[PDB]
């Protein structure tokens, strides 16, 4: 299995610099070009550049000259992209890819002067099939990762996109199971927030 | 540099129908040495990284369903989905793979049309923990409906309420092509406890009373 492991989500201040990593495995690192691609929210894919670790050759598109610097470490099979002089326009998801076939999961970069805020997670039980809810509010920045139990109820899960009110993000998620599932079996809302390194489990319990 | 132009920008079709989208380049992508067109098709479903569909203009990647077919040569290329399924909801990008910089097209957004569907509404009073913290959010879910333009209305004690309401739609569903939205009424703990009845409606109505 060819795999490309990209570094985790990043929060950086304007003017600062970040070094995104992409560790490769499952193939010969020095025999293929590693591609880097940018994607702003709701926008298309934008090619940044490429590196050939075998000999250190690099290619860039005009818009990303200076902004992006591509390097590679053969001993660790890791491709790096340094994004310098960061501005709000650099806030995006960045992918690494070997040619066209294999893609990393992407790294979300947020460029902001605002501080990290851990979310408050609330369980939402029904009023006094069944639908349960989980409220995640007052966090910064995106993203958060919400999952129900071990991701087995994902067939009936709707996790809604975060809304931004007063510089903080608020998210909610619904899970719909048959009435024989809950509260007979336990259902837990699992929320993770990398930027604040917070992981909280809230069990949906009857009111 | 090579400019990739995709058309249409977006289209909506019903499941089972055939779809053709275009990708044009400002220069030929045909490699003279091996007579292969270095054009690549990607599929990007909502919330996921781009997935390879077709490379060398017409060569399908392993795992990719046979209903996806790429064709064309030189400067004109087409992607065909012979029988669109609900899971085909995505944006489709073509990429110049012939010479650096490897430019992308602006993509073609594929959306799905389906029969009208009523939402399943559920309303949730503020949790005990949020109330203890001093806040009070009333959350309403409207799931699995179509089309997207649904009208959610709030009522407090029989009177219409609009202030403090934030709506949020999901992307179209990959399995049934329906939409879902959350509507959250946000007010302070004191503002919440000055009232009794809370109604969320689309008519499909869900409501509770603090007794
Ligand atoms: Cl920083
Ligand atoms: Cl080597
Ligand atoms: Cl098929
Ligand atoms: Cl591009
Ligand atoms: Cl239908
Ligand atoms: Cl309800």
């Amino acid at each position: 299995q060819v795999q490309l492991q990209q570094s985790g989500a990043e929060l950086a201040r304007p003017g600062a610099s970040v070094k995104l990593s992409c560790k490769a495995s499952g193939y010969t690192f020095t025999s293929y070009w590693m591609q880097w691609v940018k994607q702003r929210p709701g926008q298309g894919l934008e090619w940044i550049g490429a590196i050939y670790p075998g000999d250190g050759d690099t290619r860039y598109t005009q818009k990303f000259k200076g902004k992006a610097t591509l390097t590679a470490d053969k001993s660790s099979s890791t491709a790096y992209m340094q994004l310098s002089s960061l501005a709000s326009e650099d806030s995006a998801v960045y992918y690494c890819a070997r040619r066209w076939d294999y893609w990393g999961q992407g790294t979300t970069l947020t460029v902001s002067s605002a501080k990290t805020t851990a979310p408050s997670v609330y369980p939402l039980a029904p009023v006094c099939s069944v639908t349960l809810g989980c409220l995640v509010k007052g966090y910064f920045p995106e993203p958060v990762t919400l999952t129900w139990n071990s991701g087995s109820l994902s067939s009936g899960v709707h996790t809604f996109p975060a809304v931004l009110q007063s510089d903080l993000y608020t998210l909610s998620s619904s899970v719909t199971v048959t009435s024989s599932t809950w509260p007979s079996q336990s259902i837990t809302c699992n929320v993770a927030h990398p930027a604040s390194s917070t992981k909280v489990d809230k069990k949906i319990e009857p009111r | 540099q090579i400019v990739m132009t995709q058309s249409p920008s977006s289209l909506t079709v019903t499941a089972g129908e055939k779809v053709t989208m275009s990708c044009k380049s400002s220069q030929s992508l045909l490699n003279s040495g091996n007579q292969k067109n270095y054009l690549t098709w990607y599929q990007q479903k909502p919330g996921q990284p781009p997935k390879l569909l077709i490379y060398w203009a017409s060569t399908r990647e392993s795992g990719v369903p046979d209903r996806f077919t790429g064709s064309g040569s030189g400067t004109d290329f087409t992607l065909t989905i012979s029988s669109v399924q609900a899971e085909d909801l995505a944006v489709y990008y073509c990429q110049n793979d012939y010479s650096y910089p490897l430019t992308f097209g602006a993509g073609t957004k594929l959306e799905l049309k389906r029969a009208d569907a009523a939402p399943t509404v559920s309303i949730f009073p503020p949790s005990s923990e949020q109330l203890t913290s001093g806040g009070a959010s009333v959350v309403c879910f409207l799931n699995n409906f179509y089309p997207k333009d649904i009208n959610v209305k709030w009522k407090i004690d029989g009177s219409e309420r609009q202030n403090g309401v934030l709506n949020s739609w999901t992307d179209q569903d990959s399995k049934d092509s329906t939409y879902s939205m959350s509507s959250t009424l946000t007010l302070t703990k004191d503002e919440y406890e000055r009232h009794n009845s809370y109604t969320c409606e689309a008519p499909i109505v869900k409501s509770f009373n603090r007794n």
Side-chain angles (χ1 to χ4, degrees), chain A residues 2-207, chain B:
Chain A
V2 171
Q3 292 182 348
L4 301 181
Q5 183 65 28
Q6 302 197 235
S7 43
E10 288 282 348
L11 173 57
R13 300 190 52 87
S17 173
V18 294
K19 194 172 187 179
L20 273 50
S21 64
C22 173
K23 182 159 189 170
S25 61
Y27 72 96
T28 305
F29 187 62
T30 50
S31 296
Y32 291 88
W33 286 90
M34 187 76 71
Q35 188 171 181
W36 288 89
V37 180
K38 175 185 180 182
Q39 185 173 43
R40 294 274 288 176
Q43 310 306 324
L45 300 173
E46 190 171 15
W47 194 77
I48 302 184
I51 185 172
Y52 198 85
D55 62 353
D57 295 352
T58 52
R59 295 294 188 269
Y60 300 88
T61 194
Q62 185 68 33
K63 287 184 55 183
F64 290 100
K65 296 184 180 181
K67 171 66 63 180
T69 310
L70 302 182
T71 55
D73 194 345
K74 293 184 297 181
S75 64
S76 66
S77 296
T78 306
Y80 295 103
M81 178 176 67
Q82 186 206 57
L83 297 172
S84 60
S85 301
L86 292 170
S88 62
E89 288 81 7
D90 295 315
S91 294
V93 175
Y94 295 87
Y95 297 102
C96 68
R98 195 204 81 174
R99 307 177 84 185
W100 49 70
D101 191 15
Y102 307 96
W103 286 67
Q105 285 302 298
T107 298
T108 303
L109 178 61
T110 296
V111 179
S112 171
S113 52
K115 296 178 180 177
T116 303
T117 308
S120 299
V121 186
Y122 306 115
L124 307 184
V127 297
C128 301
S129 64
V130 59
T131 297
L132 310 182
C134 181
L135 180 58
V136 183
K137 74 172 308 176
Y139 67 91
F140 181 88
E142 289 179 348
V144 283
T145 295
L146 191 151
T147 176
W148 295 91
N149 291 4
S150 299
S152 297
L153 305 180
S154 54
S155 179
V157 170
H158 299 104
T159 293
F160 305 90
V163 293
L164 186 63
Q165 190 182 34
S166 67
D167 310 329
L168 294 176
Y169 289 98
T170 290
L171 174 145
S172 69
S173 176
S174 66
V175 52
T176 302
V177 298
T178 158
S179 50
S180 62
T181 305
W182 190 87
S184 59
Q185 304 173 5
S186 64
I187 297 181
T188 295
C189 179
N190 309 113
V191 184
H193 188 233
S196 60
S197 68
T198 54
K199 288 196 171 187
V200 21
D201 300 337
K202 297 293 184 175
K203 182 182 179 182
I204 312 298
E205 303 177 358
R207 300 176 185 265
Chain B
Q1 307 172 199
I2 297 183
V3 177
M4 309 299 295
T5 303
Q6 288 183 257
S7 184
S9 301
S10 72
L11 77 167
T12 301
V13 292
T14 310
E17 296 297 320
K18 192 188 75 171
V19 163
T20 292
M21 59 193 71
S22 170
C23 175
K24 297 179 179 180
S25 59
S26 59
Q27 303 176 27
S28 176
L29 306 182
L30 182 66
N31 184 289
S32 63
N34 58 10
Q35 295 298 316
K36 294 180 179 177
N37 288 277
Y38 281 79
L39 188 275
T40 303
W41 286 98
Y42 302 106
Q43 177 193 54
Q44 187 172 32
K45 301 183 181 181
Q48 297 188 14
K51 171 190 174 183
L52 170 71
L53 282 185
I54 312 293
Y55 60 93
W56 292 336
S58 57
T59 298
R60 186 163 49 253
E61 176 65 20
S62 295
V64 175
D66 197 12
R67 66 181 184 271
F68 290 96
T69 305
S71 60
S73 174
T75 57
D76 184 71
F77 303 94
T78 62
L79 177 65
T80 301
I81 315 177
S82 64
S83 184
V84 177
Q85 300 182 1
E87 62 178 356
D88 298 344
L89 169 89
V91 182
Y92 296 84
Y93 298 96
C94 70
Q95 184 190 30
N96 153 42
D97 190 84
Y98 178 67
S99 61
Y100 301 103
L102 306 184
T103 44
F104 288 94
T108 291
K109 181 163 187 175
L110 180 59
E111 305 176 2
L112 276 93
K113 180 177 180 58
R114 53 150 295 140
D116 287 16
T120 55
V121 184
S122 55
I123 190 173
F124 297 87
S127 62
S128 298
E129 286 113 297
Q130 187 187 26
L131 288 177
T132 308
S133 61
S137 300
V138 186
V139 180
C140 181
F141 291 136
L142 296 83
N143 299 334
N144 310 318
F145 62 90
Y146 189 90
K148 186 178 182 179
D149 56 322
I150 197 184
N151 291 88
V152 52
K153 189 169 301 181
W154 281 86
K155 289 181 182 177
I156 298 183
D157 295 327
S159 297
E160 187 173 359
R161 173 63 181 256
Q162 294 127 313
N163 300 327
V165 174
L166 294 181
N167 297 335
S168 179
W169 277 261
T170 57
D171 293 319
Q172 195 167 17
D173 189 270
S174 294
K175 290 191 291 183
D176 58 25
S177 312
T178 65
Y179 295 92
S180 289
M181 68 154 295
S182 67
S183 183
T184 307
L185 175 62
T186 304
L187 25 65
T188 73
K189 181 183 183 176
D190 274 79
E191 293 176 5
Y192 170 72
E193 298 186 45
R194 293 195 310 262
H195 301 276
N196 289 276
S197 181
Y198 292 89
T199 296
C200 175
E201 61 184 358
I204 308 181
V205 179
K206 287 290 182 173
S207 178
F208 69 92
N209 195 286
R210 293 176 58 247
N211 306 320

